[PDB]
Amino acid sequence: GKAKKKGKSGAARNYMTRTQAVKKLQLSLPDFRKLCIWKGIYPREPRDRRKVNKSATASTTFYYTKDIQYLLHEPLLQKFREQKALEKKISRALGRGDVSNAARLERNANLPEKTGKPRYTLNHIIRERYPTFQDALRDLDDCLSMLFLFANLPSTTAVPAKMIARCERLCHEFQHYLIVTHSLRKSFLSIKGIYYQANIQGEDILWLVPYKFNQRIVGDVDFRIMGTFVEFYMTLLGFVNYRLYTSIGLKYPPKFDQVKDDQGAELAAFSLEGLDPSQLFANFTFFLSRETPRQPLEFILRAFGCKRIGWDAVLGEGAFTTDESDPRITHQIIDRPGRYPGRIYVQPQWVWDSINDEELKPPELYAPGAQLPPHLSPFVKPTQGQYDPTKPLEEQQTEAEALEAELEDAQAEATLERQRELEAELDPKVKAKLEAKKALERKKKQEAEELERAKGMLSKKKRKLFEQMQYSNAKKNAEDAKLRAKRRRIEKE
Amino acid sequence: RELIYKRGYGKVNGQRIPLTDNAIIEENLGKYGIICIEDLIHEIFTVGPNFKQAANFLWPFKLSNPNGNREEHINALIRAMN
Amino acid sequence: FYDLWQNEEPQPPNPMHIPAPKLPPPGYDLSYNPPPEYLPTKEEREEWEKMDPEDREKDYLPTKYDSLRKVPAWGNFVKERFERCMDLYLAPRVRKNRLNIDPNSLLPKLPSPDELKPFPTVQQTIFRGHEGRVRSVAIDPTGVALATGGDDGTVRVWE
Amino acid sequence: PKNPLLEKRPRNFGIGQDIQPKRNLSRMVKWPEYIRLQRQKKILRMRLKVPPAIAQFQYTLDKNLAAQAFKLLNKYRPETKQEKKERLLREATAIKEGKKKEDVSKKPYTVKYGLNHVVGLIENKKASLVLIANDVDPIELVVFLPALCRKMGIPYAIIKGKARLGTLVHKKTAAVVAITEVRSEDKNELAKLISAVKEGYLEKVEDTRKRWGGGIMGFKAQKREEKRKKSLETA
RNA sequence: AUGCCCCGUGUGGCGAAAGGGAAGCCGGUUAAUAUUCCGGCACCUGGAUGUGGGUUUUGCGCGGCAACGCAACUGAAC
RNA sequence: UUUUUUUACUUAUUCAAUGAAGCGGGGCUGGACUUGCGUCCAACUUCUGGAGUUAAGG
Structure with a gap:
């Protein structure tokens, strides 16, 4: 029977704000952000914000109290404090002017700039974050997109170039596992870049690879948050690469030559020790020009099981015969704004389309200097009303637009009283089509009248929800009708 | 190739624009046969008739500050700076 | 290295854990050579380029490029991954049961008026004597006469 | 708009x-x-009359001459503990081989520090140059050093920073340092430094070392003083 | 949001079964307790979270000259 | 150089006030005298039992 205060119990204990969490954990905000990113802590939203904090806003972020306590028990805090103290000692030595002591303290400080590695050990962090290997495989899309992006991207103060090179080694080892196990199934080319979907141990993973060009760094971007995510994903990718190579039986890591990497063989530079998609392009030798992207074509052909692939020596090394005069080249992929009868000149778009469809499309449509068929995304699952470009417009079309198109193709009591007064004083098919259109109009009017009666019988909040659903469906049907109409225009052209 | 892909800027009409697309390099050169960033990197790597034009078109790279002549030690310096 | 999963014991997921929202799969629109019905007008291109940022519903415009060498890379490809980074740890995660029902399910089923006839359906008589608004009407209990009142102050009886 | x-x-x-x-x-x-106390302590030492033996410590070396001295001193900084351990290990290797310590080692040349050690060197006239820290607390540990150096004929200079001298001698704080002997190539630099120290410091401070310090008033009291002097000059 | 900003007001505890104070009544029952048990019929405080209502597509309800009324009627610091 | 008298200074010491909030010296503006430009002296809120806070602006 003890009296209780209001703000003490319930959601107030269940949630705490980010300010209170930082003050409880005795941390700076960058350290708190790094810990949250590595541990997987995310804000969440309370049922009633006023119950938790009396002066609360839609802007403020609440956290789970057990998440904050678990961060408190995390042992990376002692490493953070030790590194802060060691940095203070290094600055003290540099100010006092002895460089030998500063270097001796730096070698304990274990800098990511000199190591090319994450500064802390995240192995146990990976262990609680992904308890099982299938969960680890499910969470790989963001990892692969991140590490391919930072393989492409320039280095900065937060992201060392040695660490970028280690990202490149890890992703190349992952690519060699993919082409060894043939684990890729889907490949897509888009204005975004190259989307790759691989099914590794029954889990579909799709990631984006940007095109080889100078990536724009305009605007405000924080590479420190990027660096934290990169360090986590490098640790995860290294461990999953080791497990995949151990499952395949190959030795990890694959030894890559520094001279070969300096030459630029990359996938050819990394060599792996022994200790229908394969049938597609199983026995064919393909040459690549300068304009063609050599490492995506080499990746997709090795994933499809191409035995030999060659390209220009300026593009890379560790390939087949770079000379086009060599008769061994069965096919050639070139996109230029010669004329060997043995060599079949075909498009990279044909390569993407063939690896998507497993059909080996004819090179006549994809001849150079000729317009190629439009490329299609394999990831799209068709649905009712979402519209399908592959589906015929005759197969899918609303009745009003169908009768309007039919009338356009054909073109390409009061009346009885007037007839009585007048007497006292192809085209039939078009008229029948107009009568069918009028019957459709009257049917739509009847349906609208029934809809209005039901809307009137609805209650107020149910009426508002019903109108919102009708508005959303009307927007979707409007976009679908616009797509169908301009597809009809393309068909007429 | 890493320097070209990382810090690549074009000097056109007294301006400093990045080499985001190969179409910009194609419009800049046009008649010399250089229409791609890969082609420009190849012409930089292997000396050709348009080497001087390619060097004039390519802006001087502004490397980040690291924290006699070298025969082969310049690669480590370039990796540390970029 | 060593693989972390020396011993894998199946652990039930806690109900408090909410997985991150997965990015949607790419559509037919995203391709560099899409079907031509996805392409917009130059008026739509100018509409976006006049429109403010984050007002547009979709972050990419339908673009068709003939050549891979003519394909330009995005100027915000770093930015979208940066936004994905910020959404992973900064955006709140909510478990919400979104309704997916037929809209006509909420509508009640009404009998047709043809079953419920007779009812008045068309105007058959007009009484015109009032220059002001007709305030009140009443019908004689015998059903013969009509009484009307108006703003003119005149009460009238009609057949 | x-x-x-x-x-x-x-x-x-x-x-x-x-x-x-x-x-x-x-x-x-x-x-x-504590902040208020340290500020009023400085103020009280300014207000009272300081006897010459303490007031001589207000005049120190200028920045150029201090840097010129430190250019010589940094060549003769003592061995750190790690460098000493390495020297002991290398000498132990030579002794294990049987070679002589005279053969493997040579006479060291370092800046001499420690108060009793430096005072002994000054009394035995082995010191060539003596640098005395500005801010030794208690001041009685160094208040006799300029007079002792004047008695012994050793050139001397008062220099800002016991922490600065401790950084030379790999300590936190050194109250006094001494140069006694240098290598052959630095003898000209030492002689030039001693002559520059004489002409810059000692000739300047010979007049002012005998004067009493202190007597400075506060800002408002000073402004009252020029106001009364201006009124007297107008009258 | 490897830091920054805001505010002044101080300082804790004990000290009343007659002061202040959230909320329970009737009937019955024991050898002996009962506003405490039983039966019936209620109330207060604290918490979580739904449904139905209210508001909203022009965001934050209407009426009365007024005193004010109406089941709700956005409301952080100060 | 020392012994007495009074007569200035503030730092010892004593008293008081405050949430240690605007002290002192200049600068700007106005008014006075002066000398032909130095002083001193003032900037700001008075018919009303309302309100004054989260900076407007350049």
Whole structure:
């Protein structure tokens, strides 16, 4: 029977704000952000914000109290404090002017700039974050997109170039596992870049690879948050690469030559020790020009099981015969704004389309200097009303637009009283089509009248929800009708 | 190739624009046969008739500050700076 | 290295854990050579380029490029991954049961008026004597006469 | 064009009209007792008359001459513990081989530090140059050193920073340092430094070392003093 | 949001079964307790979270000259 | 150089006030005298039992 205060119990204990969490954990905000990113802590939203904090806003972020306590028990805090103290000692030595002591303290400080590695050990962090290997495989899309992006991207103060090179080694080892196990199934080319979907141990993973060009760094971007995510994903990718190579039986890591990497063989530079998609392009030798992207074509052909692939020596090394005069080249992929009868000149778009469809499309449509068929995304699952470009417009079309198109193709009591007064004083098919259109109009009017009666019988909040659903469906049907109409225009052209 | 892909800027009409697309390099050169960033990197790597034009078109790279002549030690310096 | 999963014991997921929202799969629109019905007008291109940022519903415009060498890379490809980074740890995660029902399910089923006839359906008589608004009407209990009142102050009886 | 709906509303901070804006009140902060005590300690030492034996320590080396001295001293900084351990290990290797310690090692040349050691060197006339720290507390540990150096004929200089001298000798603080002997190539630099120290410091401070220090008044008291002097000059 | 900003007001505890104070009544029952048990019929405080209502597509309800009324009627610091 | 007298200074010491909030010296503006430009003296709120806070602006 003890009296209780209001703000003490319930959601107030269940949630705490980010300010209170930082003050409880005795941390700076960058350290708190790094810990949250590595541990997987995310804000969440309370049922009633006023119950938790009396002066609360839609802007403020609440956290789970057990998440904050678990961060408190995390042992990376002692490493953070030790590194802060060691940095203070290094600055003290540099100010006092002895460089030998500063270097001796730096070698304990274990800098990511000199190591090319994450500064802390995240192995146990990976262990609680992904308890099982299938969960680890499910969470790989963001990892692969991140590490391919930072393989492409320039280095900065937060992201060392040695660490970028280690990202490149890890992703190349992952690519060699993919082409060894043939684990890729889907490949897509888009204005975004190259989307790759691989099914590794029954889990579909799709990631984006940007095109080889100078990536724009305009605007405000924080590479420190990027660096934290990169360090986590490098640790995860290294461990999953080791497990995949151990499952395949190959030795990890694959030894890559520094001279070969300096030459630029990359996938050819990394060599792996022994200790229908394969049938597609199983026995064919393909040459690549300068304009063609050599490492995506080499990746997709090795994933499809191409035995030999060659390209220009300026593009890379560790390939087949770079000379086009060599008769061994069965096919050639070139996109230029010669004329060997043995060599079949075909498009990279044909390569993407063939690896998507497993059909080996004819090179006549994809001849150079000729317009190629439009490329299609394999990831799209068709649905009712979402519209399908592959589906015929005759197969899918609303009745009003169908009768309007039919009338356009054909073109390409009061009346009885007037007839009585007048007497006292192809085209039939078009008229029948107009009568069918009028019957459709009257049917739509009847349906609208029934809809209005039901809307009137609805209650107020149910009426508002019903109108919102009708508005959303009307927007979707409007976009679908616009797509169908301009597809009809393309068909007429 | 890493320097070209990382810090690549074009000097056109007294301006400093990045080499985001190969179409910009194609419009800049046009008649010399250089229409791609890969082609420009190849012409930089292997000396050709348009080497001087390619060097004039390519802006001087502004490397980040690291924290006699070298025969082969310049690669480590370039990796540390970029 | 060593693989972390020396011993894998199946652990039930806690109900408090909410997985991150997965990015949607790419559509037919995203391709560099899409079907031509996805392409917009130059008026739509100018509409976006006049429109403010984050007002547009979709972050990419339908673009068709003939050549891979003519394909330009995005100027915000770093930015979208940066936004994905910020959404992973900064955006709140909510478990919400979104309704997916037929809209006509909420509508009640009404009998047709043809079953419920007779009812008045068309105007058959007009009484015109009032220059002001007709305030009140009443019908004689015998059903013969009509009484009307108006703003003119005149009460009238009609057949 | 500007929106017509935006207008300026000035705030008049006169007496009794608006709430005063947040200004910098650092001049009037009620400080903690240790801060207040150290400030008043400095002020009291300024206000009282300082006898010449303490007031000689106000005059120190200038920046150029101090840097010129430190250019010589940094060549003769003593061995650190790691360098000493390496020297012991290398000499132990030679002794294990059987070679002589005279053969493997040579006479060291370092800056001499430690108060009793330096005082002994000055009395035995082995010191060539003596640098005495500005801010030794208690001051009695060094208050006799300029007079002892003048008695012994050793050139001397008072220099800012016992922490600066401790950084030379790999300590936190050194009260005094001495150069006794240098290598052959630095003998000319040492002689030039000693002559520069003489001409710059000692000739300048010979007149002012006998004078009493202190007597300086506060800012408001000083301003009252020029106001009364101006009134007297007008009268 | 590897830091920054805001505020002044101080300082804790004990001290009343007659002061202040959230909320329980009737009937019955024991050898002996009962506003405490039983039966019936209520109330207060604290918490979580739904449904139905209210508001909203022009965001934050209407009426009365008024005193004010109406089941709700956005409301952080100060 | 020392012994007495009074007569200035503030730092010892004593008293008081405050949430240690605007002290002192200049600068700007106005008014006075002066000398032909130095002083001193003032900037700001008075018919009303309302309100004054989260900076407007350049």
